[PDB]
Design a protein around this nucleic acid. Structure first.
Ligand code: 3AT
Ligand code: MG
Ligand code: ZN
Ligand code: ZN
Lengths: 49, 197, 343, 348, 199, 50, 103, 148, 65
RNA sequence: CUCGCUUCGG
């Protein structure tokens, strides 16, 4: 719930009181079907290390 | 623009929240035969108490998937089994359990035990040491009771709670307790009439 | 016997099912009874050799025989960190309208390798942000994206609609300082890869900036590292304790790397033998076969290091190895000079 | 004149974790300034603060009086509060990755040549230990090959120099002691230290951890003062990580995979337990079930079913522990007691 | 189903911890607010803030729980004796017989410095010395060792070897440990008790 | 939040800081590493003597 | 100011010395340790890093007899330099004749 | 001669309680001249032994046959005529325990010497006459040579 | 947002191999064989290209222009 | 600023 990552496609025009973005987000290598259903891979919030 | 540093909180999608304790140079990192040096070295000791076998299976599946260019599924009560990813790993020339022969970066000698290598989806948390770091000089005080304010946003000082006072009492340090609770917080000089009180 | 065990301990690194054994270098004076492991320069010069096995541009592979683990690791670490290169440090921005943030853009520009030879420059002094002809380079990046005046009515693809919508690193133009134009022939100073995607634009957006590149070592920052991957591995030597024939020999050929174990029909029956032990990666799949566990003995030769050096294209890897050796020599010379000054 | 100087090295500073349970939750340390942005301290002091480095924030007070500073240094010095007042047990002791490293170091398998032993010993020669002669112990095996055992290297920590007056002596039982060997246990689990030399046994939580007495650091504190104990802790915290990193200690998915014997035993145990549970169910439902004293028939059935399930679980755990091989990292971490237990291994 | 049951157990643990934190916090506050007044005076009597006596001697004996080496006993005599033997092995002195050990222990104990020590500790020391003397006698009877010091196999003298120097060192060490294990007057006994119970 | 519990028995103080912690085994058990930024803020009044 | 010697104690015994090397790391430390351990007159050689934050290493040399422990240090440095020169020459020859046989 | 003990032993068991350690094994041995039982931990990786092996074992106070007990420090690089030249497996340890036999309740003559070569344990048990010269906190050398 | 220039672990130049990779996906190539043809041997660069999401064009759809 | 409310962190 507190993971850092992209918010949406309009995250640049949006002006919020506090916003956290990741420079190079990557979709997970091991993805649940729930990730596909909610289209989480379109807005990843982490990196594979 | 912030770069990860000491104190930055890191998670591993399995409840293994951690703090970046040390940032070593690349050459000091251990390397495999292929020349791959890890980005994150995580302590094995976190596993036995928490029994997060899911992290190990995720690491193995991710290694197999990146080797064969696929996206394995970790779906609840299902997903890719261990046998298939082991077969993929052995087909690709790696060990069937992820453990790889590793040479120590420091001494230049091989390690006695095989090391568990693989890609893990680590996510950075909003808790940063830069935002949380706080230091308080004399600073401002509150009008009602002339004591330092509460929060970091208001440049407040830390609070000696009741239990801190209890611990100081248990130590018997009378002078330090007096200095902390009287001299350094709300010392004042009043004028008392010795006749009327 | 005992002598064979001692020789294996001091010459071979054996890989067991659960762990590696004999990993420590032990040939030191007084460590062994029947061996005089005192330093002998003549013996080392006799035994040592270098054999290049594969060398193309931005890739080198060579076996070093007779050296120890400490010196090989020192060479690897010097190649990784202590070899100076040319890379971007300062970015002066004039009207960056791009979506890519200024700090992110500067970080991306810094990671771009530069084909300039580092030996011809010097380290910029502390401070001196202006930079002089000797110790800096300047690169101008000016890309203005605009709509294509001639395009199809639909033109769904951005390539037809727009021009300069992808800021490739070929747009970087070297700006000579002082007499650098005469010293360096045209085309020598340039980004190495010429195709790195720096940023992406839309019409109206513009990127105008100047880049100051200064000499640096990979220890200070990873953008200065010349080698993509500089590593070494001990040369494997798989040995067969007993002759393996029949279909189990084919199983042997399937347990190891495809090209290391070869099966031959000496008398019409397949018998396996070690063909090219170098090609093995030690997947250790022979341990799964219960019967074949006790017939092979996987090992690494202690004093045989195959170095693989894949460079980023700044300069050919052979010059990189020469520079690494010279840097180690320079460290030794610096400390010898300090010791002489002390005494 | 009063000069409001910056906090420099050597200043006595109070250090506290805000949820305070006992008096050791707040201690006075000596400040050393470092370029990074976090409060850093030796991990052996994690147990009193109950800190875990998972984002926990700690408070730091600076006394503004000489009397307060002296009171903090004397009464609340870390060297002066190595034992909790509740029962006198040592709280500041070795923790995970120190118990494991020392246990692997002091195992009977370890054998070092001169170079590796010299490196491991020289790992400790920093700070106040820069002004001492090393006193490399004589090698144990010397004719075929000159080898130093791991126990000698560990005992170097207790008494590094010739002039060190520390002579630690201890005789206790380890976690995996058979109970009959009496310093000749097959597992080599009887710890015997004579004159700051490890004669037998392997280090573990029972002797190096913060559990209770018989701790070697506790013996040092009670026999030779606080300074020797603190120096031993620092030497251990500097030596064990070096050896553990140079040796390599990893856990993999195959370290927790089950063997064929475990699978067969688990299948047989599950079948037998389910058959017995079905027999008990049939006995209660149709007919008379032998009622245990002090409880009803349904509670008796619940107790019997719980007993059978526990039988299945513990026999499966015994089978998995028996079929497990050595150098298995979960098993190693369970044996030395650094983290986990046999129950966790059986469950996972 | 198994996952659901496991999650049930985990949530039970979590809520248990959540309630426990608050309950013990309140109990700790009450205990400290009640017990904080007491102080170990210089006459070894624990007194309240008003001067009333709660205990004539703390813990009945007057020993510090923080320096309590044994299982609520100030010393483990066997460990102390073994440490004394190992630290000071006197190779140039003969071993002691049962009668000799008892005589030298009785001679040393009657010195002035042992008078201020508590009688119970002296009785425990006497009991331990009697036990070790009985052990020495049993060993020498088993192996026919002669107290004259002329038994031919000298290794037999290494079985239960004790020397008067070791006895003096052991007695002085025990007396010093007992003296340094007493409550230092002025200690906040009540707060220590409150915290050591609440935690 | 009353005077007795919030401002008399336990009260806020200055000359204090609060930071995330990270391990450091190279320090003695009686030492703590303080960031340079915090040390520049937390001051100690030293009296000038001979 | 880079390499500083520090004797075993205030007595200034030359048998046990510690050389503090500045802006150095495990590269030179490990290579020099290997090259100086092969000297028969060195009882104990060992390097350590004081702290990962600061770039300095402490080498410790303890000899057998009455060697000043600076002579083994200089000898090890010279041997390492000679080894580096020899390997440079051999590697250059290998590269050159590999190129020649390629064409 | 500083030879404290010397006898020919025959191995009766290699690992009665399992293959515990990869490099170290717990030999059980019986003497021929006397009834001296020996429990000895050895490094089989460098000096392998078998069940039927017979070896000469010598426990010596000093490693020099001339009787010079000057053992302040040992130099492996030093070359000089020593006792170790006659043997194959030399270990260095301390006799850290002397324990009387408790199985015999009365009239017992058996003793046991526990020597710890850096954690490698040796219990030499038998008649107290043969153990003459053994003392606690005394450092000894074990020399082992396999016979035909 | 955009493809990183360098691989995180090893450091091989991977920024210039992105668009060509897309071409191999615009062609009939699978993921694995396209990565093999691009020359990414070790799995870290394969993870770099395979797990990267191209958010730059989606963000540019919201650019001022 | 005061106050309350939520969401966090631990
Ligand atoms: N409400 C609270 N009161 C006091 N301390 C707390 C509170 N919440 C968190 N903490 C701090 O966090 C620590 C709790 O961690 P603990 O419960 O031991 O592990 P955990 O959170 O169960 O982690 P695992 O789930 O076991 O991985 C101990 C305590 O100092
Ligand atoms: Mg925590
Ligand atoms: Zn008045
Ligand atoms: Zn890569």
């Amino acid at each position: 719930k507190q993971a850092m990552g992209t918010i949406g496609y309009n995250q640049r025009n949006r002006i919020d009181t506090l916003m956290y973005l990741l420079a190079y987000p990557q979709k997970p290598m091991v993805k649940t079907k729930t990730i596909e259903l909610i289209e989480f891979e379109k807005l990843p919030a982490g990196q594979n290390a | 623009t912030r770069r990860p540093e000491i104190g930055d909180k890191f998670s591993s999608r399995h409840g293994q929240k951690g703090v970046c304790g040390l940032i070593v140079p690349q050459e000091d990192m251990p390397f495999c035969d292929s020349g791959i040096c890890p980005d994150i070295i995580m302590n094995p000791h976190g596993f036995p108490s928490r029994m997060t076998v899911g992290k190990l299976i995720e690491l193995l599946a991710g290694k197999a998937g990146v080797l064969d260019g696929r996206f394995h599924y970790g779906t609840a009560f299902g997903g890719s089994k261990v046998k298939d990813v082991c077969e993929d790993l052995v087909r690709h020339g790696y060990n069937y359990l992820g453990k790889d022969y590793v040479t120590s970066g420091i001494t230049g000698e091989p390690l006695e035990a095989y090391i568990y290598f693989g890609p893990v989806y680590y996510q950075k948390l909003k808790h940063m040491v830069l935002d949380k770091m706080h230091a308080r000089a004399r600073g401002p005080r509150a009008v009602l009771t002339r004591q330092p304010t509460e929060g970091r946003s208001r440049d407040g000082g830390l609070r000696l709670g009741e239990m801190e006072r209890d611990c100081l009492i248990g130590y018997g340090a009378s002078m330090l307790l007096l200095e902390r609770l009287m001299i350094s917080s709300d010392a004042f000089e009043v004028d008392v009439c010795g006749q009327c009180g | 016997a005992a002598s064979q065990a001692v020789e294996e301990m001091r010459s071979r690194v054996v890989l067991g099912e659960f762990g590696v054994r004999n990993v420590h270098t032990t040939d030191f004076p007084g460590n062994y009874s029947g061996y005089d492991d005192a330093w002998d320069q003549d013996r080392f010069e006799k035994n040592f050799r270098v054999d290049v096995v594969h060398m193309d541009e931005n890739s080198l592979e060579f076996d070093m025989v007779g050296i120890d683990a400490a010196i090989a690791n020192a060479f690897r670490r010097i190649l990784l960190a202590e070899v100076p290169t040319m890379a971007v440090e300062k970015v002066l921005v004039y009207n960056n309208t791009s979506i890519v943030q200024d700090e992110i853009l500067a970080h991306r520009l810094g990671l771009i390798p530069i084909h300039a030879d580092p030996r011809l420059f010097e380290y910029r002094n502390q401070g001196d942000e202006e930079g002089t002809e000797i110790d800096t380079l300047q690169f101008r990046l000016q890309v203005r994206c605009t709509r294509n005046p001639h395009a199809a009515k639909d033109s769904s693809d951005p390539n037809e609609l727009y021009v300069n919508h992808k800021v490739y690193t070929r747009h970087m133009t070297w700006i000579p300082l002082g007499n650098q134009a005469d010293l360096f022939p045209e085309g020598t100073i340039r980004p190495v890869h010429d195709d790195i995607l720096i940023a992406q634009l839309r019409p109206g957006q513009e990127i105008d900036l100047l880049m100051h590149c200064v000499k640096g070592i990979g220890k200070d920052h990873a953008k200065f590292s010349p080698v993509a991957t500089a590593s070494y591995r001990l040369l494997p030597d798989i040995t067969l304790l007993e002759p393996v024939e029949g279909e189990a020999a084919e199983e042997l050929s399937r347990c190891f790397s495809p090209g290391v174990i070869e099966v031959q029909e000496v008398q019409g029956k397949k018998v396996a033998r070690v063909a090219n032990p170098r090609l093995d990666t030690f997947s250790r799949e022979i341990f799964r076969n219960e019967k074949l566990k006790k017939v092979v003995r996987l090992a690494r030769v202690r004093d045989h290091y195959i170095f693989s050096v894949e460079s980023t294209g700044v300069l050919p890897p052979d010059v990189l190895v020469s520079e690494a050796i010279k840097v180690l020599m320079g460290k030794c010379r610096r400390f010898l000079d300090e010791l002489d000054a002390v005494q | 004149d009063i000069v409001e100087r910056h906090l420099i090295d050597g200043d006595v500073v109070l250090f506290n974790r805000q949820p305070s349970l006992h008096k050791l939750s707040i201690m006075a340390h000596l400040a050393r300034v470092k370029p990074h942005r976090t409060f850093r301290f030796n991990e052996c002091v994690c147990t009193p603060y109950n800190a875990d480095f998972d984002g926990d924030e700690m408070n730091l007070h600076l006394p503004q009086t000489e009397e307060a500073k002296a009171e903090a240094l004397v009464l609340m010095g870390t060297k002066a509060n190595l034992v909790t007042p509740r029962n006198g047990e040592p709280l500041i002791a070795a923790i995970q990755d120190f118990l494991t490293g020392a246990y692997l170091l002091t195992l009977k398998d370890t054998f070092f040549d001169r170079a590796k032993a010299c490196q491991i010993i020289a790992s400790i020669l920093v700070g106040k230990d820069e002004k001492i002669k090393v006193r490399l112990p004589p090698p144990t095996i010397l004719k075929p090959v000159t080898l130093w055992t791991g126990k000698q290297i560990f005992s170097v920590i207790l008494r590094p120099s010739d002039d060190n007056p520390v002579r630690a002596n201890l005789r206790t039982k380890g976690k995996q002691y058979c109970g009959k060997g009496e310093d000749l246990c097959a597992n080599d689990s009887y710890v015997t230290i004579q004159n700051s030399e490890l004669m037998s046994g392997s280090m573990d939580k029972g002797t190096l951890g913060s559990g209770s007495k018989n701790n070697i650091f506790y013996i040092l504190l009670r026999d030779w003062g606080q300074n020797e104990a603190a120096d031993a802790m620092s030497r251990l915290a500097r030596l064990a990580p070096v050896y553990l990193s140079n040796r390599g200690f990893s856990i993999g998915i195959g370290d927790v995979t089950p063997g064929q014997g475990l699978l067969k035993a688990k299948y047989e145990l599950l079948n037998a337990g389910y058959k017995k549970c079905d027999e008990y169910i049939e006995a209660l439902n149709t007919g008379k079930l032998q009622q245990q004293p002090g409880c009803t028939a349904e509670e008796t059935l619940e107790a019997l079913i719980l007993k059978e399930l526990s039988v299945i679980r513990d026999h499966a755990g015994s089978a998995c522990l028996r079929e497990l091989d050595k150098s298995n990292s979960p098993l190693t971490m369970a044996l030395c007691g650094s983290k986990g237990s046999f129950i966790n291994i059986s469950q996972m | 189903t198994e996952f659901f049951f496991h999650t049930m157990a985990g949530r039970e643990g979590l809520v248990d911890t959540a309630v426990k934190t608050a309950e013990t916090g309140y109990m700790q506050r009450r205990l400290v607010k009640s017990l904080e007044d007491l102080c170990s005076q210089y006459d070894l009597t624990v007194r309240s803030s008003t001067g009333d006596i709660i205990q004539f001697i703390y813990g009945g004996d007057g020993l510090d729980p923080a320096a309590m080496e044994g299982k609520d006993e100030p010393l483990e005599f066997k460990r102390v004796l073994d440490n004394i033997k190992a630290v000071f092995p006197c190779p140039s002195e003969p071993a002691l017989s049962k009668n000799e050990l008892i005589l030298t222990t009785e001679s040393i104990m009657k010195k002035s410095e042992f008078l201020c020590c508590q009688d119970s500790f002296l009785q425990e020391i006497k009991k331990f010395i009697k036990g070790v003397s009985e052990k020495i006698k049993k060993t020498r009877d088993k192996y026919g060792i002669n107290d004259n010091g002329t038994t031919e196999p000298r290794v037999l003298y290494q079985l239960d070897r004790i020397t008067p120097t070791q006895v003096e060192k052991f007695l002085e060490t025990c007396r010093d440990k007992y003296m340094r294990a007493q409550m230092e007057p002025g200690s906040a006994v009540g707060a220590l008790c409150a915290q050591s119970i609440g935690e | 939040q009353g005077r007795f519990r919030g401002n008399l028995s336990g009260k806020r103080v200055d000359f204090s800081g609060r930071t995330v912690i990270s391990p450091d085994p190279n320090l003695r058990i009686d030492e703590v590493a303080v960031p340079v930024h915090v040390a520049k803020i937390l001051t100690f009044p030293e009296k000038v003597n001979k | 100011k880079t390499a500083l010697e520090m004797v075993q104690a205030a007595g200034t015994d030359r048998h046990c010395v510690t050389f503090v090397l500045h802006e150095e790391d495990h590269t030179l430390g490990n290579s020099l340790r290997y090259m100086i351990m092969k000297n028969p007159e060195v009882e104990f050689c060992g390097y350590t890093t004081t702290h990962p934050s600061e770039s300095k290493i402490n080498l410790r040399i303890q000899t057998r007899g009455t060697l000043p422990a600076v002579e083994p240090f200089q000898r090890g440095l010279n041997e390492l330099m000679n080894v580096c020169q020899h390997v440079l020459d051999k590697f250059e020859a290998s590269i050159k004749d590999y190129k020649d046989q390629k064409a | 001669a500083g030879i404290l003990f010397e006898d020919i032993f025959d191995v009766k068991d290699i690992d009665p309680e399992g293959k515990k350690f990869d490099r170290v094994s717990r030999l059980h041995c019986e003497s021929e001249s006397f009834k001296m039982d020996l429990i000895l931990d050895v490094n089989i990786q460098i000096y392998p032994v078998d069940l039927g092996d017979k070896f000469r074992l010598v426990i010596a106070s000093t490693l020099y046959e001339d009787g010079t007990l000057d053992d302040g420090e040992y130099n492996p690089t030093d070359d000089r005529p020593s006792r170790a030249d006659q043997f194959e497996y030399v270990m260095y340890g301390k006799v850290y325990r002397i324990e009387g036999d408790e199985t015999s309740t009365e009239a017992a003559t058996r003793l046991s010497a526990y020597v710890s070569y850096g954690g490698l344990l040796m219990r030499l048990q038998g008649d107290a006459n043969n153990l003459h010269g053994f003392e606690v906190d005394s450092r000894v050398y074990l020399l082992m040579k396999k016979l035909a | 947002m955009i493809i990183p220039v360098r691989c995180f672990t090893c450091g091989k130049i991977v920024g210039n191999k992105w668009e060509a990779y897309l071409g191999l996906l615009q062609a009939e190539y699978t993921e694995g064989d396209a990565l093999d043809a691009l020359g990414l041997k070790r799995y870290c660069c394969r993870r770099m290209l395979l797990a990267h999401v191209d958010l730059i064009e989606k963000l540019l759809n919201y650019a001022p222009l």
